[PDB]
Design a protein around this ligand. Sequence first.
Ligand code: CLA
Ligand SMILES: C/C(C=C=C1C(C)(C)C[C@H](O)C[C@@]1(C)O)=C/C=C/C(C)=C/C=C/C=C(C)/C=C/C=C(/C=C/[C@@]12O[C@]1(C)C[C@@H](O)CC2(C)C)CO
Ligand SMILES: CC(/C=C/C=C(C)/C=C/[C@@]12O[C@]1(C)C[C@@H](O)CC2(C)C)=C\C=C\C=C(C)\C=C\C=C(C)\C=C\[C@@]12O[C@]1(C)C[C@@H](O)CC2(C)C
Lengths: 168, 177
Amino acid sequence: EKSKAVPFLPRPAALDGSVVGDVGFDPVGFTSWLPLSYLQEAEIKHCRIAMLATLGWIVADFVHLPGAVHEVSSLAAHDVAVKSGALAQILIWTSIAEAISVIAISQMLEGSGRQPGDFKFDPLNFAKDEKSLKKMQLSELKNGRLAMLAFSGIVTQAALTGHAFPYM
Amino acid sequence: ERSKSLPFLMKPKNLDGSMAGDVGFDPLGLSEINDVGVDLYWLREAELKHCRLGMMAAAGILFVEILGPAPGFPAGKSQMDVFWKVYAEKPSLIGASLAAIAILEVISGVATTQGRQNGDRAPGDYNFDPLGFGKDPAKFKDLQLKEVKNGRLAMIAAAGMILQGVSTHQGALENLS
Ligand code: CLA
Ligand SMILES: C/C(C=C=C1C(C)(C)C[C@H](O)C[C@@]1(C)O)=C/C=C/C(C)=C/C=C/C=C(C)/C=C/C=C(/C=C/[C@@]12O[C@]1(C)C[C@@H](O)CC2(C)C)CO
Ligand SMILES: CC(/C=C/C=C(C)/C=C/[C@@]12O[C@]1(C)C[C@@H](O)CC2(C)C)=C\C=C\C=C(C)\C=C\C=C(C)\C=C\[C@@]12O[C@]1(C)C[C@@H](O)CC2(C)C
C-alpha cells in the first residue's frame, strides 16, 4: 500500500521489493496483466540500446570514420547508412542476437532461472558478490533510463532544429 | 434538519459536516448522484481541482498584469490574447506544459478512482506538503477551510477573467478602471 514513488497511489501489487530499481512506479498497472520478467527484460534491452545510441549519436556528430559516406550528421546518417548497407550488417547481427534472445526469454519465462537481462556477459568482473551486482544493476537501470530520455530529447531537438551537438 | 446556508431547504443527506466549507448549499441535491462514476468523492475531488486551478490562474493573471511579464516573454496586458503570442514564438513550451499536465491528470484520475475504491485517501489529497505547513491537526481543518474558500473565490474570479478577456479583449484591471 502507498507505493514509494507515488505516495498517494496504491502499491502496484506486483512490485513488492524484490527487484532492482523497484520504487513501486506503475500507475497504469502494466505489471497487472504482463509478466514482470518480460517487462524487466524489455526495459533493460531499451536501456542498453538507448545508451549505445546516445553515445553513438553524440560521438558521430564529432568524430567520423574515414570515407565520404561517413561525412553526414547523425540526423541524416540513417538514410545514408541504409543506402550504403552499413545498417544492413547491424541489422543482420542484431537479428542473430535477437533470435538467441527469443530462445533466452522463452526459457526464462518457462522456468530456467535466468534473471531478466542476464546474459552472463562479464569478461571483467565489476561485480563480485550479490551486493556489488545489485548496486551495479541499479546503476545500469538508472543510467539506461536517463539515456533513453536523453536520446529522446536529442532526436526531438535535432529534428526540430538541425543543429550540431548542442541541440538547443 | 434544515441546511445552514439555505434555511428553506432540508439538510442534504450526503453533506453532514465533514468537508471543509460545508454549509449545506446543495439546492439541486447533486451530492446524492451515484452514477456514471460520479459521487460525493468525485464531486469533491473535482471541486478541489477546480479550486486549485482557479487559484493558480487568478494569481498568474494578476501577477503578469501587475508586475509585468518575465524577461523574454511577450507583453500586451490581455492574458487571453497573449497566449497566442507565446505560442507563436515558444510553441515547445506550451506543448511540454500540456504533455506534463496530461500525464499528471492521468495520474490524478487513477489516484482518484483508486482512493474511491479502497478508501484510504481523502478527496483532493496528493500528499503534497513539502514544507510541512499542515502536519498537526486543529490547523489542518483551518487550512482546508481557507483553501476551499479561496479556491471558490478564485474559481469565480478566473471564470470572470476568462470571459472578460474573450469578450472585451482587454486586461482584467483594464476592465476594472
Ligand atoms: C545503437 C547503436 C548504434 C547504431 C545503430 C549506430 C549507427 C551508425 N553509426 Mg554509430 N556509434 C555507436 C552506436 C551506434 N551507431 C557508438 C556506441 C559509438 C561510439 C564508439 C559510435 C560511433 C560512431 C562513429 C565514430 C561513426 C558512427 C557512424 C554510424 C553510421 C554508419 C556507420 C556505422 O554503423 O557505425 C560504425 C560504428 C563504429 C565504428 C563504432 C561502433 C562501436 C559499437 C557500437 C560498440 C560495441 C558494441 C558491440 C559491437 C555490440 C555487439 C552487437 C551484437 C548484436 C553482436 C550509422 C548510422 C558513422 C557515421 O556515418 O556517422 C554519421 C561514424 O563515422 N558511429
Ligand atoms: C478519459 C479521460 C481521462 C481519464 C480517466 C482514466 C485515464 C481512464 C483514469 C481514471 O480511472 C478514469 C478517468 C476518467 O479519470 C478524459 C480526459 C479528459 C479530457 C477530455 C480533457 C479535457 C481538457 C480540456 C481543457 C482543460 C481545455 C481548456 C481550454 C482552455 C482554453 C484556453 C484559451 O487560451 C486559449 C487556448 C485561447 C485563448 O484565446 C482564450 C482561452 C479560450 C481561455 C483553458 O484551459
Ligand atoms: C526532461 C524530461 C525527463 C527528464 C527525466 C529525468 C531527469 C529522469 C530521471 C530518472 O530516470 C532517472 C535518471 C533515474 C530513475 O530511476 C528516476 C528518475 C528521476 C525518474 C522529459 C521531457 C519531456 C518533454 C516533452 C514531453 C515535451 C513535449 C513537447 C511537445 C509535445 C511540443 C510540441 C510542439 O512544440 C512543437 C514540438 C512544435 C509545435 O509547432 C507543435 C507543438 C505541439 C506545440
